[PDB]
Each structure stands twice: as structure tokens, then as C-alpha cells.
Subunit: 400 residues, 4 copies
């Protein structure tokens, strides 16, 4: 229970200042350093490589706890583990023996530069062009680069160009964020998730060395189409998002209840004597706390299954598909819950919760409303429906 | 027709500047003056007395149109008519003969100072102490004094104190906002409705003269108990709120639709080619536009009944109770609609509608989430249920 | 008010026996004859042809009132007017001169035989093959032939075959239900709407004469595609369906309230003394009564617009398309309302309301759940969404 | 796994005949005997006493499995284990050492006679009169006596009367169903759950011997008041109900999907070619399947906690209350889920799924609509709200 105590104490500290910090936007440098000092970035690194030797259930629990205090920090922390999962699923034994001890000593907080802002999500234009001795040159602009600012390493994705061994192949690389040619642009100014630094990043002539490549170019595509072990990255990452949503939900419900206990007035017109005994106040907390309990218990069970399959040598398409269905289902339920709860709980608090902007309760809705659009829930719902009705497991990709 | 065209033209100009103005909060003086110049503040004053001689259906449609452009200016405009209605329902013929031509010539924009911030609503501590001549001295601070800033007259409520004829009787008056001892405080910094100037007003020995009094002390309480004609004030005012919600909903839907046509990207992962042809985008617009059509059509019929009873010399408890039930029903449907739609419409626009704070679409949710808390919709629901199941009309009050 | 009084009295009498009658299914001959004796089948025929010269709002009110007592009789009554509307929109002047006085004298109650059970709803295989002197011979089986038992005339649709003037044109005709070769099969055995007689009808060498044809073959296709006046048939008919749903909803709500008032027990475990004072019982009635009030008020407005356009010589596509959007909106709201209400109201009554099957309250859900599937509400939603987002009116058909 | 395989095979046979059997109502003797032969009634009896030595998670999964095929048989099965649970928590080791081997050898299927039909659910009037040798005489009529027909023993509750040591104290006993003076009345005729035999049972001078009593008079009240281990009976039983709802939901979803794949027609008006590819069809299955996956996964965690506490020598009120809150939440979520999906899934199948009564899909709604009224979900919601807001665990009782 040590690591979860550490996460709980971090969250408590973040709650003190989240109201003022998220107003300002920009990079939460002090808080990212506190996460560095905690050791929790090393949760999944073996004790023999200097890490904590912990499990995915602990990582997921920590993500939700931090997110309940500060959704931007929960996001950055969660994405770090999505990035680490990808690295761990593709890195060579030589890379792990070098990088993981270095990640411990240098306290790596990972960011990524992957998606783009072209005509649709499938329009990637950041190129990797071959160089002598096996290196590649990266050129182009990425969007939504969460945790790009103050990142020690960047997980970067590119498509091969002018390549003898085949163009259009996906290369992934882990590079220093201060490698020459990398310009983090700092243009993140969002409705919510305001301290995630998910702005854009520009690559001009950026050199990637062979010992920084995560597998061969195109290997990720072969791994996902085959259902090799790396195909677990998507269910892992979508369950990370799910725990952000559950964390936000719990934090909003607890913050509302504290207000209701200390500040709500009884609607004495109706003969109510204390707000905490109002039948409709109680119904609102009951409806949402009940959904939250079930979603949280369900999410713990799926997290255990992530760990079980994480430890296998081989995961069958059926095992991967079943897990993805369970994860997609959890994310759908958590999405609906957090969006409804963060808006409707005002009705259990009263008008003065909104009349004083500085109370800042709208932060929960703004954070959830921003992140839940990451990928459209309507097509997660379609994927689960296509599984149930047509017995088709979703096609492994970066999003399913 | 002409009045509604003027309202439409006002709304158009407000839409240009609302995003910038509402961020700043404070008093929309230029826009209040444009409303003064439009003549619409006199909509319900008879032509005999210099007004437009128009009807409540026209007022309500004008409220919704302006609210759809700028919710604070729709609120200010609507509340002016709630203040006017109270004056019209309690003032003597002699008072109206003087006040109403004055309001036309001087372009009066009314505000109010009524509710307070103590243990529960209508736990009132602002006192009216009788003076030998029949004047009253007012002392205390009012809260939520919408339209208090830049008001030509304030509708004010107090409770008698040191009164041989009975303490605790509610008096009302219409007084100049710069009467000695009136301090309008400018302490309004809210989630939404940011330019309604609903801060506090402090009364330091404010004298109210006998010709400014509206009825006799406790007369409002007796009219409420009687369910007689002055008790129409509440259904009238609750239907004003309803039209703020319908206007916000219509404005949000049309603003989201503009973004969907111009900015949303197709989810090519699912093979869709234009976002405006996505089946799930279309379902969101259809579900909410459909509910809006029915709600608006229903509201027009209730507004018609408001006009009918407004014109009568006498109104029975049964007519008043039936109207209040119809108004409550409209408010319930409009409340649920606007709260769901201003949040869920993000799902038809995509992540970039939230990723870019300056788009500012969240203004609709913030405005509606703030105002819908005015009084709890749960007890409007109880009131309709008590009528339908038990044949009990609501107990008339400032809220029912 | 005379016509509505007659409908109200018919509905009262139907309420007495509906529970026993709908159990058995089959043909409600005594109740159909009661409608014949009432004269209401002639609501839309002019007084100068023997009819009542009434209006569509009267018809719609009578439909909802009768449906609230007996959904099957309300369906039969309403479909009579859909059949009549089709006849009136396509019939020649000499057809109207002979048919309408005859329909009064002989107290005609119309049925139809239109849809079929092939691969999809567009797949029509009942043929019209040319005979000498301009007659046609009809062959094949129709499905869902509402009101076909005890019908004085059937409205019948076929597609031309072996026709030198063109194959696959849609012809419509009004014929005697006992013409040689017409076999009403009596196979309607439904979850709800159990006395609408909507089973199959088999046509074996059935002769149709030129003076029974409603326009030329293919004329309905042209009138709908061009938006000429007969394109009103679909919004007229879809609003008929809407009033079935509103009538069922009102009937179920009122029947539930009676049980709650006289049989529901207080949940004394929570200190409730009377079920009628339970806060959650009151909340259920309030929610649904409020939505019904708004839906009914909105439906009245749309019914008036039907009458207004019914009286026009020409109706533009904007006028027809805006009416169809308003009708579709009303139907969507009424559909959601009646399906939720007829199921959820058990929670306001208690277990014994379901545990005593004889109480029969499930009739409302059975009737509503059956009819609301007539055409899919999801595509009504898409049609409203396509209009609001893309400014595309529904393309006229038998369904839109 | 062996045990779950046996339950799956039973369910598969029950599925073949449930549609025909449940119309008839009455007692499903052949199916009860198949359950007797399966051994599964002994799931919780230790191997030492001739039982299967299985756990509550296995029991709950078997209940859901059987319920998905035949809700009445799942109900009868599940209530057997609620009856067994009461016996296990209150009987002496000496009693269980005789009864449990006898239950194995004689293939006991337990029923109960507990609730009554007086002014409210707390109003109990079936009396137990103490006789001088320590026996009691039971007199009066019980209602809702699930499984009272063909029962090998009945768990019976009464209140002491003519008792010098205190009237009104609750006594429980396990007695033969054919003891002199027991009359099972066969008056069950319900909307759903039609073969649970939950009719009335009348007791005329029925003798209960000392060694048939479960604890001492009032002992159950003392256990509830102290939140001690016997008060686990409620969360155990409420989670049995929860698995009936999850079972019905899964059965209904799977039956609907078979129709959608086999019989639904594409809505060609809108350009659909396959119903199984319709976007709104897929969205219904996706929404409901996703909620079911999360609810089932959360339910498994709670079932493990039931087993954990079942094995404890002592249980604190905090452990009992935490478990009850988790069970209540699962029940709330499952109730809402099954009620919505058993009605809305028609929209995925089409009109002919309701127009052909013999398809019988309404059985799912009828079963779930009937059972979910067992106790009011509104007060389960209040109980979870009171815990979350005010940190008050539910007051232990037969319902909470
Ligand atoms: C945006 C807004 C404007 C309001 N304007 C007025 C007003 O002009 N006059 C008034 O008496 N109360 C006004 N109220 C207050 C309500 O009557 C009520 O006192 C308040 O919403 C209750 O606060 P509570 O739910 O936090 O207890 C306003 C409330 C809001 C939210
Ligand atoms: C708060 C937030 C953070 C995001 N972080 C990342 C990220 O770290 N890496 C990435 O590839 N995409 C990230 N995305 C983007 C999604 O993968 C996707 O590209 C985008 O949300 C689609 O935008 P649209 O719906 O407006 O078309 C993020 C999106 C949001 C809203
Ligand atoms: C299908 C069904 C089965 C029931 N079985 C039992 C039972 O076996 N034992 C029992 O004590 N109560 C049983 N109950 C009853 C509840 O304990 C409770 O008394 C009842 O649902 C209250 O009915 P009301 O809401 O109409 O007041 C059953 C109820 C239903 C609906
Ligand atoms: C209760 C009921 C009555 C119906 N009556 C008629 C009718 O009178 N004339 C007609 O053409 N179709 C009638 N329909 C059928 C619809 O036009 C449509 O063909 C059918 O609901 C589609 O079936 P599906 O959803 O199973 O594919 C009726 C349908 C129902 C459910
Ligand atoms: O889910 S994101 C994403 C979407 C599409 C392609 C790559 C990535 C990526 C990498 C790291 C974290 C998060 C994400
Ligand atoms: O609804 S508000 C209110 C609540 C309670 C007492 C008085 C008043 C008042 C007067 C004018 C406008 C608005 C309001
Ligand atoms: O709406 S039904 C229908 C569907 C499709 C083709 C024709 C018809 C028709 C004719 C009369 C009444 C009802 C209907
Ligand atoms: O939940 S039921 C119930 C309600 C109230 C008192 C006793 C009982 C009882 C006993 C056995 C099974 C089921 C039930």
C-alpha cells in the first residue's frame, strides 16, 4: 500500500493549488517535479533496474487518485504510462538495460508527439526519411502533444518517406526532448485540461539514431495486425483514459458533498430543515454515487485482467478482443457518468455554487468535457455493438 | 411584427460582442442604452400612457430572441418586465398615471433588490421602520440584485420593524437608485450570467416616501394566500425564466451547427466522409432540435394564457393555479433541455471545439447552469406531481 | 364543442370494456358500429354533402381522447381519417360527388391494404394488371391491413405489371371489402393494438374499375416528389400517430394516479405515512405530467397548421417541409414520453400493480410499444437533424 | 466450472420450453425436479455435509445463468439460496448437522412464507402463540410466498402473540410444507415471473416444534439492530435480486440480437442494405451491451466480498454497511439497465417483433418490470445518497 499512499499524499497537495494553477494554464512545473520526487513514474520498472516493481492495478489506482485532485496532472501521469507501455512493448533488451536505469536516475517524465491536425485523424504528414548508417530524419508538425513541455523524452511517430525499404511505414522513436530541431510550441489554451501542455511540436531536420528506434519501421503495424503482445497498448491506454474519467467523477462528487454539508441551505418553502436531509438532494447523490461504485468496481476487475495478460507470453486475438470490449465498455460508461455528474451536481448544491465563479466547481465539467472528446464515444459504442450483434472484435489500431 | 424585428436587430448586434463583454463581467452600459433607445422597455405600457401597448406573447418571444444572443442582456431585459409586472399588479391607478408616462419619457430600465443571503430564502433581515408621516426607513443589504447597476428605478422589498401595526409585514416600493443611502455594490463575479449585475445593494437609512409604496404592508402575502390576481406575478416571472432557457438552447444549437458545418472533421476510421453526414452527429442535432420545437410550441400557448389572465379584472385561485402548473411544466422541460444540450452538443462538434478555449461555446452551458439554479427544479417537479396526483395547486409564493 | 363531447362519451363507454375486449383480440364490431352511429366518421366531409364540416384539430383531439380509453379503437378511428385524407387528396370531382354522400348515408368506416412483408418496406409485389376498358386485376397479399375487417371500403395499393402504359407504377383504389377475390385473413395476433385487425389480406383476381382508381398510375409518386398538395398526406398521418401516443400517455398517467390514490401503500420503513405524499412518487407523476402538458400544448399548435395548409390551394416545399419537421418533432417527443411513462409508472404504484395480472395496466405499454415501431423513430430523428444542421427538408414518401 | 457447466445445461433446456410454460403460469414441477437432480441446490452446503462446498460467486453466476433462460426458474433457484442463507445465519450447529445432510439426501428445494398484505410492509399479523412445551402455533395468511408450491420445507416468519415474555417478537422456523394446517393457495397470477408460485399461504393452528425454530424470538431484530453477521442476509438477498436483473438483461439482449440477425429488415428508405449494419441498430446494442459488461464486472467484485464476509466468525456493522451500500448500488444500476433495455430493444428489431405476439419477447420486460418492484429502487437510491453525503450506513432491515 506504500505507493498508493504516496499518490494520495501527492493528490492532497495538488488540491491545495489546482484552482489558481489551472486558471493560468501553462506548464505545472513544480507539480511535475513533485511527481518526479515521488518515484511513482518508475512504478512499472523492475526493482532490478531500480524501479518500484509494481503492477498495473496500482498504476490505474494512482492515476484515478491524482486525477480526482487535478485532472491535468492525472492526465500527464496517465499518459506517461501509455508512453511507457509502448516503449516497454517494443524496446530491445539492450534499450531496457540502458534506458530504465537512466529513467530512474534522471527521473524521466515521458511525453509524446503522435497525432496531427490535418483533414482527418488518418492524415499523417510528419515524415521519417532514411539517413546513412541507419538513422532517420524527422520533419513536420504534430498536434495534441500531451506532456511535451518539460518532457525528458518524447515518444515520436513518423511515416517513412523516400525510403528504399518501403514508404508509408510507421517508425516510432524515443528521443531526448532537447534534441536539435525539436520546437515545442506552447500553444495549448483549452476549455479544460488546461495544464496538460497538449499543444503542437515542430520537427525540422531532427535526427533519430538506430538505438532510439522502437522496433523496425512498420513493426507496430505488423504487431497490431497480428495481435502480438504490443496490441495490448490500446486497451491499456483506453483504460488509462477511463480512470481519468472515474477520478474526475469521484473528485467532483466529493467536492460537491463537502459543499452540500457545509453551505447548502434548506428549501424551507417545502418544509425542509437541513439540505443534507432533502429527499431530492439525497436522490442526486445516490443516483451518481451508485453508478460510480459500480463503474469503479468494474474498472478494478478489468485492471486485474490487463495485468494478467500483461504477464503472458502470448495473448490470443480472442483474449485481446475480449479485453478491448471490456475496456471500451468501461470507457463508455465512465464517459456518460462523468459528463452528466459534473453538470447535474450543481442541482444538489444550489445557485451560490455558480454565483461565485471562484468556487471553481465548473473545473470538473470543463476537464471531463474536454478530454472525453479525445475519440468519439459514439464509435466506441458502435464497436461494442458490432462485437455483440455481429461477433466482430474491434480491429486493433491506435484507437481500437 | 415590428417589435420583434427590433428585438431581432438588437440581438444581432449583441452577438458580435458578447464573447468579449461577458468575459469582463461588469455593467453592459452601451447595450442597456441600445435597449433604452429601442423603445422595447415600454412594450407592456398602454398606448394611452405612451407605451407600445403590446402583449405578453410578444414580450416572451423578445426575451428568448435576445437571450439567444446574450443571456445576460436577455436576463436584464426579462427581469425588467418581472419588475414592471409587480408594479402593475400592486400600484394604484394614480401611481401608474404618473409613473408610466415618466418611464416612457425617461426610458426607464428597472432593477430590483429583493432576495437576501441568510439561513434560507425569504429569511429576510432588511427592515422597514415606519416614520411618523408614513414613510419608511430601510436598513440592510440585499443579495442577487439583478439589474441594480444603471437602474432608473429599483423595486425593493423589506419587512416592517418597530411597527405598532405589526412587525414582519412585507412592504414593496419603487425608488430611484440614487436615493440617499442606497449603495449598489458591484460584487458580481459569477460562472455565467456574468453581465446581469446581480451583486448586492446596501441600504443605509434609506427613506421611502408614501407615494413610492406598492400596496399596504403584507398585501403581497395576502394576495398570495388568496391566489388572487397579483399572485400572477410568479407564473409570469417563472415563464420569463423559461424563455431565457429556451433562448439559450436555441442559440447554442445554432452556434454548434455553424461549427459542425465549418470545422468538424469526419471520422474516417469509420469510413465517414463529411461530419455533416455522420449518423451520430445528425442524431444529436435531431434529438435536441425536436425537443426544442415542441418546447417552444408549448411555451407559446402558455404565454397566450398569461395574456388572457393579465387582462382580467379578477382572477380565481383555480385559474392562477392552472396557469402556474402549465408554467412549471414548461420550465421543467426547458431546464432539462438546455442543461443537456449545452453540454452534449460538444459531441457533435469534436475535440477542437473544446481544445480552443477562445471558441467560447461553453458560455451557453455556464449561463444556463447558473440561472437554472434560481429555484430548484426538483420542487417544480413536485408541484406538478402534487397537482396531477392530489389535485392540489401549488401554494402561491415568490417561487411557486 | 359538440363533436368533442360525442367523442368523450364514446371513450367513456369504451373504457368500461377495453380490458376484457383486447384480451381476445379480433374485431370490435359493436364499438365500430357505435362510432358509425355517432357520425364522427364524417367530421371532414362538408355539411353540404351530409357531413359535419369540422376541422383537423377536432379530429386530432377526438383521436387522442378515444385512444386514451382504447388504443385500438383510437387507431381504427384515426386510420379512417388517414384513409379519407388520401382519398380526398387524389379523388376526382365526380368521385367526391358520388362517394361522400354515399359515405354519409352508408356510415362508411374505411380500412386499407397497403404495406407488404417482403425484403424491406419499399419491396411491393402485389400487382395491378391491365384488363379491358381500363380496369385492373389485383393479385397478391398485403400485410398490416388496419381496419380491414368490417370495412365498408378498402384503400388498396398495387404496382402495375404487364402494362403497355408502363410497369411498376403505383396505383391506388377504393373498393368494396367483399368484392370477389378479396380475402381478409384474420391473422392479427399482436402484443398490443390487439383490436385493430391489422392482419393480412389476399387478393385473387380482384377487379378494380376506372371509377375506383385514385388518380392515374404513378400519380402519387409525382405528387410526393414535387411537393404538390397530396404531399400533405404524410405529415397529416404521422400527426395521427402522434395523437395516439399522446392519448395513450394521458390514459396511462390517469389510470396510474387512480391506483396510487387508492391502492398504493406507504413505505413506512422510511417514515412515509401516505403513498400520495411520498416525494419520489410525486416526482414520477410530476416529471411525466410536465412533459405531457408541454407535448400536448405543442401538438395543438401543429394541428392548427395542418388545417391552415389543408385549406390552401398550393403548399410550397418550405411550408410542407416545415410542417413535416414540426410533426416529426412532435412524434419523437411523444414516442419517448409514452414508452418511458407506460413502463416507469409502475414505480409510482408498487409491486402489486404488476403482481395482479388482472389489473391490466401493461396494456398501455403493450399498445404504445407496438405502435411506436410503425416506422423507426431513429430516422425521424435523423430527418429533424438533417433539417436543422443541413437545411435539408425530408424528401416526401409514405414515411416522411 | 463443473457447477457452472451444469447450470448452463439446465438453462439451455429451460430455454426450449419457457415461452409456452410461462403463459400457463402455475408450478414448473418438471423443471424444479431437474434442478433437484442437478445437485445445485446443495451448492453452499459443505462437502462435509454432503454438499458441493461451493461459493457465493458460483451461486450468483448460476442464478444469472438460469435467469437468462427462464426468469421464474432463476427466481425460484435464487430464493432457495436466500432461504438457505437465513437458515445458515440463524440455525445452531446441531440443527445444521441434521438438516443439511437431509437436504442433500432428500433433494430439498426451499420456499418461504414471510411477507403479508396489510396496510404497509411492516404490518405483520400472522401470529405465533407459545404452547407450554416450547412449541408454537402459527395462525394467519402470508402473501408473496415464492416457491411455496412443491416446497420440501418452508421458511416461515411470525410474530409472538399471547406471549407472557413479550408480544410482537419475530420468530422464524423451517417446517414441512404439508404439515397439518398449512394451505398453499395457488392464487399467483402475475404480469411476469409467472411460474414463481408467489401466491398466498394460510396457516390454521399450525404447530412448530422447538427444534424447528431458527434462533429465539426477536433474535433477527437484535441482529439487524446491531448490524452483526446475521444481518448479512439482506445484502446477500438483494444481490440475488441483482443477478436476476443482470440475467434477464443478458437473455433479452441475446434474444433480440438473434432476431436482428435473422429477421430485421434494412431501412432502405435511408439507404441501409443490412439491418445488422444500421448505425442506430448498432448504437442500441452497443449502449446496452457496454452497460451490461460494466455492471456484470462490478457485480463479480461484490460477490467476492459476500463470500469473504460469509466465512468470517464476526462481522462488524461497518463491514456489513459497506457491503450493503455496494449491493444497493449494483441493484440500482441493474434495475435501470434491465428496465430500459427490455423495452428499448424493440427499436433494434422492428415492428414485426411486437406485431407477432407469439415471438414473446415482451416476457423479458414483464419479468423484469414485475420483480424490480420488490422494494422501491427510489429508497435504495436514497440509502446510497445518505451514505455518500451523510456517512450513514443503511439501517439494517429485511429491505436494507
Ligand atoms: C443569476 C441569478 C440572478 C438572480 N437574480 C435575482 C433577482 O434579481 N432578485 C431576487 O430576488 N433573486 C435573484 N436570484 C436569487 C434566487 O431568488 C435565490 O435566492 C437563489 O438562487 C438561491 O440560492 P441558493 O440555491 O444557493 O440557496 C438570482 C439568482 C441567480 C442565480
Ligand atoms: C485533452 C486532450 C489530450 C490529447 N492528448 C493526445 C496525445 O497526448 N497524443 C495524441 O496522439 N493525441 C492526443 N489527443 C488527440 C486525439 O487523439 C485526437 O487526435 C483529437 O482529439 C481529435 O480532434 P477532433 O475530434 O476535433 O477532430 C488529445 C486530445 C485531447 C482533447
Ligand atoms: C415477483 C415477486 C416475488 C416476491 N417474493 C417474495 C417472497 O418470496 N417473500 C417475501 O417475503 N416477499 C416477496 N415479495 C414481496 C416484497 O417483499 C414486498 O412485500 C412487495 O413487493 C410489496 O408490494 P407493494 O409495492 O405493492 O406494496 C415478492 C414480490 C414480487 C413482486
Ligand atoms: C400496429 C401497426 C399497424 C399498422 N398498420 C398499417 C396500415 O394500416 N397500413 C400500412 O401500410 N402499414 C401499417 N403498418 C406497417 C408499417 O407501415 C410498416 O410496414 C411496419 O411497421 C414495418 O415492419 P418492420 O419494422 O418489422 O420491418 C402497421 C404497423 C403496426 C405495428
Ligand atoms: O492515444 S494517443 C494516440 C493516438 C493516436 C496515435 C498515437 C497516440 C498516443 C501515444 C501516446 C499517448 C497517447 C496517444
Ligand atoms: O424571482 S426574484 C425574486 C425572488 C424572491 C422575491 C422577489 C423576487 C424578485 C423580484 C423581481 C424580479 C425577480 C425576483
Ligand atoms: O402509414 S401507412 C402506410 C404506410 C405505407 C404505405 C401506405 C400506408 C398507409 C395508408 C393508409 C393508412 C396508413 C398507411
Ligand atoms: O426478500 S423477501 C422478504 C422480505 C421481507 C421479509 C422476509 C423476506 C424473505 C424471506 C425469504 C426470501 C425472500 C424474502
Amino acid at each position: 500500500h506504500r505507493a498508493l499512499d504516496v499518490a494520495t499524499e501527492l493528490a492532497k497537495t495538488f488540491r491545495v493549488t489546482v484552482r489558481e494553477r489551472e486558471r493560468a494554464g501553462g506548464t505545472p512545473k513544480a507539480e511535475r517535479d513533485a511527481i518526479r520526487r515521488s518515484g511513482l513514474l518508475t512504478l512499472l520498472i523492475s526493482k532490478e533496474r531500480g524501479g518500484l516493481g509494481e503492477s498495473w492495478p496500482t498504476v490505474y489506482e494512482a492515476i484515478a487518485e491524482i486525477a480526482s485532485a487535478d485532472a491535468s496532472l492525472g492526465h500527464l501521469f496517465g499518459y506517461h504510462f501509455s508512453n511507457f507501455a509502448y516503449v516497454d512493448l517494443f524496446a530491445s533488451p539492450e534499450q531496457k538495460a540502458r534506458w530504465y536505469p537512466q529513467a530512474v536516475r534522471e527521473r524521466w517524465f515521458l511525453g509524446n508527439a503522435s497525432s496531427e491536425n490535418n483533414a482527418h485523424v488518418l492524415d499523417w504528414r510528419v515524415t521519417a526519411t532514411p539517413l546513412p548508417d541507419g538513422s532517420y530524419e524527422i520533419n513536420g508538425t504534430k498536434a495534441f502533444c500531451s506532456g511535451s513541455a518539460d518532457a525528458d523524452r518524447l515518444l515520436v511517430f513518423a511515416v517513412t518517406s523516400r525510403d528504399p525499404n518501403g514508404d508509408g511505414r510507421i517508425v516510432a522513436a524515443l528521443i531526448p526532448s532537447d534534441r536539435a530541431g525539436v520546437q515545442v510550441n506552447g500553444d495549448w489554451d483549452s476549455l479544460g485540461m488546461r495544464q496538460t501542455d497538449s499543444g503542437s511540436v515542430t520537427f525540422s531536420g531532427v535526427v533519430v539514431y538506430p538505438d532510439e528506434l522502437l522496433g523496425t519501421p512498420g513493426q507496430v503495424t505488423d504487431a497490431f495486425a497480428s495481435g502480438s503482445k504490443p496490441s495490448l497498448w490500446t486497451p491499456i491506454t483506453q483504460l488509462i483514459f477511463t480512470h481519468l474519467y472515474l477520478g474526475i467523477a469521484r473528485g467532483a462528487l466529493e467536492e460537491a458533498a463537502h459543499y452540500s454539508r457545509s453551505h447548502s441551505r434548506p428549501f424551507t418553502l417545502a418544509g425542509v430543515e437541513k439540505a443534507t436531509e432533502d429527499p431530492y438532494v439525497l436522490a442526486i447523490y445516490g443516483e451518481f454515487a451508485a453508478q460510480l461504485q459500480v463503474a469503479e468496481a468494474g474498472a478494478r476487475e478489468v485492471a486485474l485482467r490487463v495485468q494478467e495478460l500483461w504477464e503472458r507470453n502470448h495473448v490470443t486475438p480472442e483474449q485481446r478482443g475480449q479485453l478491448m470490449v471490456q475496456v471500451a465498455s468501461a470507457k463508455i460508461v465512465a464517459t456518460r457518468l462523468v459528463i452528466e455528474l459534473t453538470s447535474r451536481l450543481y442541482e444538489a448544491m444550489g445557485a451560490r455554487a455558480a454565483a461565485s465563479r471562484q468556487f471553481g466547481f465548473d473545473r470538473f465539467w470543463r476537464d471531463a468535457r474536454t478530454h472525453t472528446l479525445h475519440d468519439p464515444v459514439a464509435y466506441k459504442i458502435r464497436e461494442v455493438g458490432n462485437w455483440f450483434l455481429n461477433h466482430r472484435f474491434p480491429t486493433p489500431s491506435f484507437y481500437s
